[PDB]
C-alpha cells in the first residue's frame, strides 16, 4: 500500500503462506468429518486421498478413498464419471499448488534483472489463477462429497490459501502498475 520494500516483503510472505497452507491442505487428510468404514460405520476424518478411523475399535487405521466403487456401481453418464475423475486426481488443488510455486519463483526471480517488469505481472497472473483453481477444486470436492458432516482444518486451510492468493495477486499487479507509473515520470523528466 505504501513504499516498495514493505510491499516486496508482504507479497513474498503472502506467497509463502499461501503455498504452505495449500500444500498442507493437499498433504493432510482432514477435509471432512463423517460416519464411514475405514477397512460398521464410525466417525472418520477424511481428506483428498485417504480416510482414517476416529474413536473406533481400531483408531488410526487409514484406507484409500473409494473413488470408483466396485460391486454394481450403477454406472453414470460421461459428466459424472468426468467429475469422479477430477475428484480422484485432485488436479485443481495440485494445479493451484503448482501455480503458487511458480508465482513465488517469479517473485523471487524479480530480484535479478529488475528491469523485466513483466515478471511481476506474470507472478500476479499466476497467483490469481491459483486462486481460481482453488475455487474450482473446492466446488468439485463439495459436489463429489454431496452425492451429519463437518469440514476440518485442512479444508479451511485451503479456503484461507485462496484468500491469500488473491490478496498477494492484487499487490503484485499494484507493483506492476507502480513500476510502469515510475517509468512514465522519469521519461517525462
Amino acid at each position: 500500500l505504501f513504499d516498495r520494500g514493505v510491499q516486496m516483503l508482504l507479497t513474498t510472505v503472502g506467497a509463502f503462506a499461501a503455498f504452505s497452507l495449500m500444500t498442507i491442505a493437499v498433504g493432510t487428510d482432514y477435509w471432512l468429518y463423517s460416519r464411514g468404514v475405514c477397512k460398521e460405520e464410525v466417525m472418520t476424518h477424511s481428506g483428498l486421498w485417504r480416510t482414517c478411523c476416529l474413536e473406533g475399535n481400531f483408531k488410526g487405521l487409514c484406507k484409500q478413498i473409494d473413488h470408483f466403487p466396485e460391486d454394481a456401481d450403477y454406472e453414470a453418464d460421461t459428466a459424472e464419471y468426468f467429475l469422479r475423475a477430477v475428484r480422484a486426481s485432485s488436479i485443481f488443488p495440485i494445479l493451484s499448488v503448482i501455480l503458487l510455486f511458480m508465482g513465488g519463483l517469479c517473485i523471487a526471480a524479480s530480484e535479478f534483472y529488475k528491469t523485466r517488469h513483466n515478471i511481476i505481472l506474470s507472478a500476479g497472473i499466476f497467483f490469481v489463477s491459483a486462486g481460481l483453481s482453488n475455487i474450482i477444486g473446492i466446488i468439485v470436492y463439495i459436489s463429489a462429497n454431496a452425492g451429519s458432516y463437518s469440514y476440518g482444518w485442512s479444508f479451511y486451510f485451503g479456503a484461507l490459501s485462496f484468500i491469500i492468493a488473491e490478496m498477494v495477486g492484487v499487490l503484485a499487479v499494484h507493483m506492476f502498475i507502480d513500476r510502469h507509473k515510475q517509468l512514465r515520470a522519469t521519461a517525462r523528466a
Binding site: 459424472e80 497472473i125 489463477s129 481460481l132 475455487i135 466446488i139 459436489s143 452425492g147
Partner: protein, 149 residues
C-alpha cells in the same frame, strides 16, 4: 427415487427452445437498437449506442443490472421498452417455475451446491476467458509499440 442433480440443472425451469429464442431475441434487439440509434446522419454521434454498446445495454437490461447509457430517441425508447417488458415476463417466469419445481416433486430442503455447480463453472470459465483476452491484448500492444519504435 430422486437422482443427483445435473451440472446444468439450473436451466431446467425453462425449455431449451426458450433459451435458444432468448439468445436470438437478444441478438435481434441489440442489432435493431444499434440500427435505429446510429444509421441516421442527422443524429451525428449524439448518442453512444454502437454495436458493442448496444449489446452491452441489452445484456444489462436482461439481467436487470441498470445501464450506463439510456436511449433518448422515440424508436430507441420503443426498443428499450419492449425489451424491458420481455425481460420482466421471462425472469418472473423462470422464478415462478423454479418455485413450482422445488415445491412439488414428481417422478423441502435447502439447495445444495450441486444444484448450482454449473453457474460456478461458467463464472470461473468467464473469469479465465477475460484474463486470456486481456493478456492477448496486452501482448499484442507490447509488440506493436516496440515495432513502431
Amino acid at each position: 427415487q430422486k437422482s443427483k442433480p445435473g451440472v446444468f440443472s439450473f436451466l431446467d425451469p425453462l425449455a431449451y427452445e426458450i433459451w435458444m429464442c432468448i439468445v436470438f431475441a437478444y441478438i435481434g434487439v441489440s442489432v435493431v437498437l444499434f440500427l435505429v440509434s446510429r444509421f441516421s446522419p442527422y443524429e451525428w454521434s449524439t448518442n453512444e449506442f454502437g454495436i458493442f454498446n448496444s449489446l452491452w445495454f441489452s445484456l444489462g437490461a436482461f439481467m436487470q443490472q441498470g445501464c450506463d447509457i439510456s436511449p433518448r430517441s422515440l424508436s430507441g425508447r420503443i426498443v428499450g421498452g419492449v425489451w424491458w417488458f420481455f425481460t420482466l415476463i421471462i425472469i418472473s417466469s423462470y422464478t415462478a417455475n423454479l418455485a413450482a419445481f422445488l415445491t412439488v416433486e414428481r417422478m423441502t430442503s435447502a439447495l445444495s451446491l450441486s444444484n448450482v455447480a454449473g453457474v460456478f463453472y461458467i463464472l470461473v470459465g468467464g473469469l479465465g476467458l477475460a484474463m486470456l483476452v486481456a493478456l492477448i491484448e496486452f501482448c499484442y500492444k507490447s509488440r506493436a509499440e516496440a515495432k513502431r519504435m
